[PDB]
Amino acid sequence: DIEDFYTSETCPYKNDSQLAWDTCSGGTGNCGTVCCGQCFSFPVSQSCAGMADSNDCPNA
């Protein structure tokens, strides 16, 4: 459950948790450990930085 841990307060998206999640933890966009405590929080923050792709993401 992420929606139960969604923070539309800091999250730039106020549509759905899946949206902001579909962004960070979507493989592209602005994935990272930042979205961990940006739109969500642990232990969800772990999923954000988890489903944020590994090397498939736009990482260095």
From Swiss-Prot:
Its main location: secreted. It comes from the Eukaryota. This is Mating pheromone En-2. Mating ciliate pheromones (or gamones) are diffusible extracellular communication signals that distinguish different intraspecific classes of cells commonly referred to as 'mating types'. They prepare the latter for conjugation by changing their cell surface properties. The keyword Ribonucleoprotein does not apply. The keyword ATP-binding does not apply. Disulfide bonds join C11-C39, C24-C35, C31-C57, C36-C48. It is found in: Secreted. Keywords: Disulfide bond, Pheromone, Secreted. Transmembrane segments: none annotated. GO terms for molecular function: pheromone activity. GO terms for cellular component: extracellular region.
